[PDB]
Amino acid sequence: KGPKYMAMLQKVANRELNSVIIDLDDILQYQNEKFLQGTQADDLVSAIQQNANHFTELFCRAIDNLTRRYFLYFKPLSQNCARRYRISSKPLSVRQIKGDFLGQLITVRGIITRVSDVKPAVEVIAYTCDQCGYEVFQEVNSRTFTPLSECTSEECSQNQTKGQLFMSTRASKFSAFQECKIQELSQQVPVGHIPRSLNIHVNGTLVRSLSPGDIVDVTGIFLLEAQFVRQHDVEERVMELITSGDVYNRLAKSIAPEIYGNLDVKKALLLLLVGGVDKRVGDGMKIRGDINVCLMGDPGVAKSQLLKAICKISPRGVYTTGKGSSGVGLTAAVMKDPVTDEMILEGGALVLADNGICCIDEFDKMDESDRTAIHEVMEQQTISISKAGINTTLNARTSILAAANPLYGRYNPRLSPLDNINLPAALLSRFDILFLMLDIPSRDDDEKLAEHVTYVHMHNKQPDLDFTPVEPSKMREYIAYAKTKRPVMSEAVNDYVVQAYIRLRQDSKDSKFSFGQATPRTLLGIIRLSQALAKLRLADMVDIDDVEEALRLVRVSKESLYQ
Amino acid sequence: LRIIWGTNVSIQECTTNFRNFLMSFKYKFRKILDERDEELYYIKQLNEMR
């Protein structure tokens, strides 16, 4: 060992590796060592950052001091090495490109929706002759080229004969080329704008470091020729939200205050966007640690506003629809690329929203093709396809929010709920929480809804209650801080859980107002909601107070039918 | 010494060693490839197939 770059050259001379990684931290330390000894620095870090395509062909010959056994790549310095000794590597958006950054090394952050297959692209074309023996090599740079049928050797110039040349697919140097489409991040896009894409052209050993359905930080030159990829004041803001008292009810009534009441439905929406605990048995079996909430209701009460507020507060929230391009908007279809002669896959709405809230407006207006793909990600976490062109398994961990209406628009008290709801038993049997948001006309309670809508239409401010509505950043930080908690259930809550489950199963196992039966998935959802309630209290254990709240929640979710 | 461009294969030397292996080979892989009667293993097959 010792001089690590010479040891890496010994390792490439031992023929064990083919990738060369150069960091700017060693450059900064060598610059510090040269500057502290009174020698001239002659800065490299301000010269590597501009025109790296000339530097990757110029420093390669200095390492060398057609026969390239290795592949040269770069990586930038972090912010920790940027604050030390007092930029070049900032997280850039695709809206923050400005046009004039064509040729700077940039680190872009974003999701990846479109990827292509690995294909061999030639760099130099080798031609062989039988008349002279001097094999020639031409260099291509563009997407296309022309065959050099005329001989340009050093022996055919001084000759009458100009004999035929042939090509060699073995002596020609190829490269594992792959194109990818990076997309703009959801909370980094401005107000009203859409997340536009950008193209990244990778080559060599980085060709298998990009699997779709993830967030990546790509560092490369901008012609995008990637060089290195990677993947994934605040305490005062969380402690002042905690210290006010009644954290759960304050965080419940803080989100979406432009509507009237319904603290229970939106309280379960709070437990829905906090997610829960993903459980792994470590023996090849993974169960869901997610909730899926149905909102079945009659028109008159607002439904798109709660859905829009949940997608606006939570990150990566994607608004969907029932009809239109939904059939291709829920699965990966195929299309012809307008920049090259290849077929690519277009991703649906379940692939750009990987870890988050996936919402469906007008659930009964869809078809069987949408339902068969929604039920598959509702049960487990992977998308399976069997059509011609792609046969992969796509990872997806999404929380399904659904908004639906009955068969005749509103409800019917003379009809059973199994006949009022057109969805089959396997769909709502998987649904742990279904909210029958039914409107009933009254004399006293309707005046408060009328007073609230006239107060929010008079001015943008909320009613004068002794509570202030919390901004999106603070509870977004609270949800991100509560998500790392892993609560463990006790034995005293275990004996209450099994007795309530036995009594609920016996009570469930067949009349006019009945609907469904008790399933073990509902017991698992009750366990997940208790874990979410313990995660919202930031506790390491699950107490008796969460199960009695969750059972009250799931029973009052269906108790509105008697009104 | 004839050398093809980009190839480390000489014609006459490989021709002579291929002929030397073909005129003389009697189950040497049974003796030195592992720790696990006949004569002229390649002459009999080539004289049979013609």
Which structure tokens are listed for A46? 């301000």
- CA-nearest residue of chain A to B4? A133
CA distance A23 to A81: 11
Q: Do residues A222 and A106 touch, judged by C-beta distance below 8 A?
A: yes
> Among candidates A389, A384, A387, which has minimal Cα distance to A372?
A384
Joined together, the tokens standing for residue A126 give 């080798």
* Of A58, A71, A66, the residue nearest A137 (C-alpha): A66
What is the DSSP code string of A81-132?
A: HHHTT---S-EE-SSS-TTTTBTBEEEEEEEEEEE---EEEEEEEEEE-SSS
Is there a contact between A230 and A217 (Cβ–Cβ < 8 Å)?
yes
Cα separation, A391 vs A83, in Å, equals 47
CB A422 within 8 A of CB A282: no
Length of chain B: 50
Euclidean distance between the first and final Cα of chain B, in Å? 34
Q: Is A67 left (phi over 0), alpha (psi -120 to 50) or beta?
A: alpha
Residues constituting chain A: 563
The chain B residue lying nearest A126, using CA atoms, is B6
User: For the residues of A145-167, what is the DSSP string, one character each?
Assistant: -----S---SSSTT-S-----EE
For A233-557, CATH number? 3.40.50.300
Q: How far is B11 from chain A (nearest CA, A)?
A: 16
**Alpha-carbon gap, residue A343 to A335, rounded angstroms:** 6
CB-based contact A547:A493 (threshold 8 Å): yes
Rounded Cα gap, residues A275 and A266, in angstroms: 14
Residues of A in contact with B11 (CB under 8 A): none
Place of tokens 């193209």: A199
Residue at token pair 């908690």: A485
Q: Give the H/E segment covering residue A401.
A: strand A397-404
Euclidean distance between CA atoms A506 and A517, whole angstroms: 10
CA A189 to chain centre: 15
Q: Are residues A177 and A88 in contact, defined by beta-carbon separation less than 8 angstroms? A: no
Most A CBs within 10 Å, among B3, B5, B7, B8, to test the A interface = B5
Query: How would you write A121-139 as a 3-class SS string?
Result: EEEEEEEECCCCCCCEEEE
Nearest Cα of chain B lies from the Cα of A92 at a distance, in angstroms, of 46
A200 SS3 class = strand
Using alpha carbons only, give the angle A171, A175, A176 rounded to the nearest 5 degrees.
140
Q: Position of tokens 């939106």? A: A266
Look at phi and psi of residue A362 and say left if phi exceeds 0, alpha if psi is from -120 to 50, else beta: left
Query: What residues of chain A lie within 8 A of the CB of B6, using their CB?
Result: 135, 168, 170-171
DSSP string, A493-521: THHHHHHHHHHHHHHH---TT------HH
Structure tokens at A287: 């169960």
* Strands A197-202 and A166-183, sheet pairing: antiparallel
For A205, the token pair is 């050993």
Residue type at A181 in one-letter notation: K
Does A133 contact B6 at a Cβ distance shorter than 8 Å?
no
Helix (H, G, I), strand (E, B) or coil at A205: helix
**A109 within 8 A of A91, measured Cβ to Cβ:** yes
Do A350 and A372 form a contact (C-beta atoms < 8 A)? no
Which residues are CB-neighbours of A12 under 8 A, at least 6 positions away? A18, A20, A69, A70
Instruction: Please say whether the beta carbons of A111 and A119 come within 8 A.
Output: no
* Rounded-to-integer distance, Cα A134 and Cα A260, Å: 85
Collect all residues of chain B within an 8 Å Cβ-Cβ radius of residue A67. none
- Judge whether B48 is closer than 8 Å to chain A, CB to CB: no
Closest-CA residue of chain A to B2 = A133
First-to-final CA distance of chain A? 80
Q: CB under 8 Å to A199, separation ≥6 — which residues? A: A179, A180, A181, A182, A224, A339
Q: Are the CB atoms for A78 and A135 separated by under 8 Å?
A: no
Q: A332-340, long-range: CB within 8 Å, 24+ apart, which pairs?
A: A332/A385, A332/A390, A332/A394, A334/A389, A334/A390, A339/A199, A340/A143, A340/A179
Instruction: Report the binding-site residues of A for ATP.
Output: 260, 300, 302-304, 405, 430, 521
The 3-state DSSP class for residue A475 equals helix
What is the number of CB-based contacts under 8 A between chain A and chain B? Answer: 8
Contact criterion met (CB below 8 Å) for A173 and A66: yes
Q: A331: closest CA among A358, A355, A350? A: A350
Q: Where are the beta strands (DSSP E) in A288-354?
A: 293-297, 318-319, 333-336, 343-346
d(CA A84, CA A325): 51
Residues of A with CB below 8 A from B5's CB? 128, 133-135
Asked if residue A113 lies in contact with residue A183, where contact means CB atoms within 8 angstroms, the answer is yes
Q: Round to whole Å and give the CA distance between A187 and A130.
A: 63
Q: Is B33 at the interface with chain A, CB within 8 A?
A: no
Token look-up 């709240």 returns A549
Is A134–B6 a contact, with Cβ atoms under 8 angstroms apart? no
Other beta carbons less than 10 A from residue A115's beta carbon? 19
Cβ proximity of A229 and A216 under 8 Å: yes
Q: What H or E segment, with its residue span, contains residue A63?
A: helix A52-64
Is B49 part of the contact surface with chain A (CB cutoff 8 Å)? no
Helix-strand-coil percent breakdown of chain A, rounded to 5? 35, 20, 45
CB contacts of A168 in chain B (<8 Å) are 6
Among candidate residues A372, A361, A368, A371, the one with its CA nearest the CA of residue A321: A361
Q: Which residues of A touch B (CB under 8 A)?
A: 128, 133-135, 168, 170-171
B47 CB near a chain A CB, below 8 Å? Answer: no
A378 and A288 Cβ atoms separated by less than 8 Å: no
Alpha helices (runs of H) in A234-294, residue ranges in sequence order = 234-242, 247-254, 263-273
- Report yes or no: B37 at the A interface, CB cutoff 8 Å: no
Mention every residue, 6+ apart, whose C-beta is less than 8 A from residue A409.
Answer: A298, A299
B contacts of A134 (beta carbons < 8 Å): 5
B3 → chain A, closest CA residue: A133
A398 in Cβ contact with A353 (< 8 Å): yes
Task: Judge whether A428 and A516 are in contact, CB under 8 Å.
Answer: yes
Residue A292: Cβ-neighbour burial (10 angstroms; 0-12, 13-18, 19+): buried
Please list every residue in chain A followed by a chain break, i.e. its C lies more than 2.5 Å from the next written N: 65, 86, 223, 232, 509
Q: B48: part of which helix (H) or strand (E)?
A: helix B43-49
Could you tell me the two tokens for A362? 């007008």
Cα distance between residue B50 and residue B45, in whole Å: 9
Q: How far is CA A389 from CA A103, A345, A350, A384, in A?
A: 36, 9, 19, 13
* Ramachandran assignment for A272, one of left (phi > 0), alpha (psi -120 to 50 degrees), beta (any other): alpha
Give CA–CA dist A373/A187, Å, rounded: 27
Contacts of A135 in chain B (CB under 8 A): 5-6
Strand order in the sheet with A397-404: A318-319, A355-360, A397-404, A293-297, A433-437
Residues in CB range of A176: below 8 A, 6 or more apart:
A118, A119, A120, A203, A204, A205, A207
Contacts of A171 in chain B (CB under 8 A): 6
Give the distance from residue B12's alpha carbon to the nearest chain A alpha carbon, in angstroms. 18
Resolution limit, Å = 7.7
**A344 beta partners:** A335
Is the CB of residue B2 less than 8 Å away from at least one CB of chain A?
A: no
Rounded Cα gap, residues A173 and A175, in angstroms: 7
Distance CA A393, CA A545 (A): 40
